[PDB]
Design a binder for this molecule. Structure first.
Ligand SMILES: *C[C@]1(O)CC[C@@H](OC(=O)NC(C)C)c2nnn(Cc3ccc(OC)cc3)c21
Ligand SMILES: [Co+2]
Ligand SMILES: [Co+2]
Length: 370
């Protein structure tokens, strides 16, 4: 049989010659408010047939999830202080490309590698020239995505080296798990947020002689996922007070949670690295040549998936920042700058992708690690 190498290099598709990829964790849905269980979905005939009818879709998520598991286990084996952020992202991405068997828009990287540090929670990846080095005391959120046929896995974990952050990571992990347990068909999104927050705030942590109650970052959220659409328009709060809109059968969610020792609110900060075409904007004729060319490059290589400046650089593009600004100003592309709490704060993140299948809830990105 074909077996994965160390370091990993064999495409997931070659490890499963039959074309059937491993299921993630399958869960009976939670009891409804009545006390009534969801054990009926497990066998039911109409649900089973409706589930089977989307089997090729779930299978594509599963392939992408297996790639995510293998990549992240590899990353955790070598990520160390002293490495530059650029070296970390490049090493990660090279492996992800190999294991997903990158093939244009058919299979690839769904969005840039997040490696946000310390008070910064999300949407940091280095641009060219960034000399930032990972430190012993750093708290680094590794957030990367894979996709097959635009079926996206968004899954993330927090890397530390100093044990002082262990309880902060435990809090956020537990909160994410709680959100995943709460989730289900017909579950109100606001209830998921309230449940996440109750858990997260049940924790207190001590870091360098100061104590904190872990705060959810109120303006960060989980999100539904659509084909080639990382944020499909439904938001999963991580605090109380959200919308009572319900989760639906067949939806896919990224259940993310973020905890902070700061304000518990992020703002835009630092140079932008992440961008993505606006999904709702259609064809716009462009005559300006550098801007036309860049848009063509984005359409060919990314479509509606997110990208970063380093990914443009790697395609041979240079001196494109004004064209990229033009596309932003035109509303064709949106910038997604780093999102950071106050200076001196610490932030942590865990995230999984879940499939609300007719027969069960599948935590498709679950591993033995988290
Ligand atoms: C998981 C995460 O990146 C962060 C949390 C959430 O974003 C917000 O809640 N933002 C508010 C409005 C400040 C979110 N929504 N989608 N993702 C995934 C994502 C989006 C874009 C991107 O590159 C452009 C990469 C990943 C998130
Ligand atoms: Co993510
Ligand atoms: Co996400």
């Amino acid at each position: 049989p074909k077996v994965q190498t160390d370091p990993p290099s064999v495409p997931i598709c070659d490890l499963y010659p039959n074309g059937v990829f491993p299921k993630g964790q399958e869960c009976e849905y939670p009891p409804t408010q009545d006390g009534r269980t969801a054990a009926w979905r497990t066998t039911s005939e109409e649900k089973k047939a409706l589930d089977q009818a989307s089997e090729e879709i779930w299978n594509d998520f599963r392939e992408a999830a297996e790639a995510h598991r293998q990549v992240r286990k590899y990353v955790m084996s070598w990520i160390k202080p002293g490495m530059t952020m650029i070296e970390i992202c490049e090493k990660l991405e090279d492996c992800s490309r190999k294991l997903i068997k990158e093939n244009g828009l058919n299979a690839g990287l769904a969005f840039p590698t997040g490696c946000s540090l310390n008070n910064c929670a999300a949407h940091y990846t280095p641009n060219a020239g960034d000399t930032t080095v990972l430190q012993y005391d750093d708290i680094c959120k590794i957030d990367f995505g894979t996709h097959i046929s635009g079926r996206i896995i968004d899954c993330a974990f927090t890397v530390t080296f100093n044990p002082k952050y262990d309880t902060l990571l435990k809090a956020v992990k537990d909160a994410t798990n709680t959100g995943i347990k709460c989730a289900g068909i017909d579950v109100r999104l606001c209830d998921v947020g309230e449940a996440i927050q109750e858990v997260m705030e049940s924790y207190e942590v001590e870091i360098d002689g100061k104590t904190y109650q872990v705060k959810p970052i109120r303006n960060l959220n989980g999100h539904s996922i659509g084909q080639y659409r990382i944020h499909a328009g439904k938001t999963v709060p991580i605090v109380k007070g959200g919308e009572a809109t319900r989760m639906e059968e067949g939806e896919v969610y990224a259940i993310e949670t973020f905890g902070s020792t700061g304000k518990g609110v992020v703002h835009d900060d630092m140079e932008c690295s992440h961008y993505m075409k606006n999904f709702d904007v259609g064809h716009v004729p462009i005559r300006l040549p550098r801007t036309k060319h860049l848009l063509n490059v984005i359409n060919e290589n990314f479509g509606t998936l997110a990208f970063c400046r380093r990914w443009l650089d790697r395609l041979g593009e240079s001196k494109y920042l004004m064209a990229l600004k033009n596309l932003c100003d035109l509303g064709i592309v949106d910038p997604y700058p780093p999102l950071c709490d106050i200076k001196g704060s610490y932030t942590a993140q865990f995230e999984h992708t879940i499939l609300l299948r007719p027969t069960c809830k599948e935590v498709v990105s679950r591993g033995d690690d988290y």
